[PDB]
Amino acid sequence: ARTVKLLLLGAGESGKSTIVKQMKIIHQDGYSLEECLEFIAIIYGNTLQSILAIVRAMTTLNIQYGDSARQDDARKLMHMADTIEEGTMPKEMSDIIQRLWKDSGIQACFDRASEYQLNDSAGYYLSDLERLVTPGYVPTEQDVLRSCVKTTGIIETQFSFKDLNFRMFDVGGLRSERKKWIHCFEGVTAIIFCVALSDYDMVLVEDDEVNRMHESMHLFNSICNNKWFTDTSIILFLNKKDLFEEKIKKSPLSICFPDYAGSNTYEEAGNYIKVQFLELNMRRDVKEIYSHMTCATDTQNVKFVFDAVTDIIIKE
Amino acid sequence: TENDEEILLKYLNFANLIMKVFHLSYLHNCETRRGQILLWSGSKVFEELT
Amino acid sequence: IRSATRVMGGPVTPRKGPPKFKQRQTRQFKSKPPKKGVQGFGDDIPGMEGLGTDITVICPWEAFNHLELHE
Amino acid sequence: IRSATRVMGGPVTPRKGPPKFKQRQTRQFKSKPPKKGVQGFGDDIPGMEGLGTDITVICPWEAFNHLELHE
Amino acid sequence: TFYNRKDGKPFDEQDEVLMESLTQFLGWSVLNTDTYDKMNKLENRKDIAQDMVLYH
Amino acid sequence: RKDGKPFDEMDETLMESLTQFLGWSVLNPDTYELMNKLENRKDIFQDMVK
């Protein structure tokens, strides 16, 4: 009412800025009708980089192409993609990409995507590359909210609800960008922390031998029990529940948490991870923390949870 | 006198025990790291020729 | 006599069933989950706990955590 | 700051002399002499503190330990 | 395969780690036994080429 | 050292074992040079017969 100051932080590459987009574009100031202006170049770059990285990792993982002739195609690509402009996908590119994806050898590498680094949304994109390459394509809103870009600077967002004045800040999730968090620490009313549920068998970009769940837990425990934010409250968010639902059956939980036992379901391990993410709080009854699942690309759950969050902020 | 020697040799059993378990922990603390560094360096010296 | 357990052949067991064997150790990491409440002998070795780096670099703001938000 | 020793800034010594530096070790013999004294914590490790592999090879007759003179 | 302990007690958790680190090291060590064969083939190919040069 | 106390025996043995391993592991970089010379010599002598 008088003022509300929200800060968004969490592990890098967790979908923090997807919430900023899913709020601003959907609700206040209207959507971006001329979305192509940026989305063309952005999606073209993403779809090119993904299929470049997969073929670069093919040699490292020693998987051999399904067919002999395929060995030629990739080479051509790696030569003809260097001298191309940005935000352009000529037919010579699309034909090669579709032919390469039409193989039983690349599937072997794509099944094991934990070892190396690829963008997660790319698996949805490239399958319909033709839809992009056809002239006049204007992206769908679901396709609009699955783009990817590095949230780097501090940006002010003004949500509106319950007749309040809102100011939302967000910051980069890399180690270097963590210095900038100190400026916005002073004089806040609430804090929001973001966690990605899918990343229990991955590694950091900066450091190749550090797990991601452990990194998130160590980041959380530091500010959770600090006295600078004793007065304020903390709101926890869980993203990427869809890929979590997909993956959780594929691989065990023993790799991340060594002493787990049982059989994994979409809900059996959820309470496991939540209780292990909330035990770190020192003040057991002095302060309370709330965590909610969330699919950032969707809008139904966003509407379900954001209004309740704002109401809980109001209640105090 | 000698009685004080008897007293010392009687009440030194509560320190012969405290000081000895403080010594074993140090040896354990060093052996663990000596094993670990050899294993992790052997991981990285057998990856490629260079 | 009979060793007070009344068994002489070999180890006996109440249960029966199919054997279960262990999986190999494929991937390794330098990291462990943050520490629990209580500690015992042999749980302070440098380099065997944490993320391999001091907490200062991961959380720079925690450096001067003594001074409050006034400044 | 009393410090209980009246010294600050660095350790002190009764006497000083020219430095002496340790020498490397090359041969690295396997075996050890037979063990005497009280045991204490931190001993009886199987591989170490022993000569060769087993007693039997060193003293082949020692197998007939329980037997008397006459046989 | 390891077939019997000397104390009398069965194998337990510590022995598995002790006898698994050794096999991990010996598994990693085959790079040298591959490089050996690669060098032993390069040498022979060079000798054959030298003889073919010498004939002409 | 990160405790304020000087090095002693149990920190001499650890870093002596580390350097022993590093000294033994110099066999690999030499074979790299031997390979990169054998291959070139083979190429020269195979281009002489053509």
Ligand SMILES: Nc1nc2c(ncn2[C@@H]2O[C@H](COP(=O)(O)OP(=O)(O)OP(=O)(O)O)[C@@H](O)[C@H]2O)c(=O)[nH]1
């Ligand atoms: N499949 C799936 N992907 C998601 C979901 N939520 C977020 N993402 C992914 O998150 C990406 C956007 O996250 P980022 O742009 O990296 O935003 P961020 O969390 O602030 O991380 P940085 O930008 O690196 O600071 C999108 O490209 C999506 O692929 C989800 O619910 N499901």
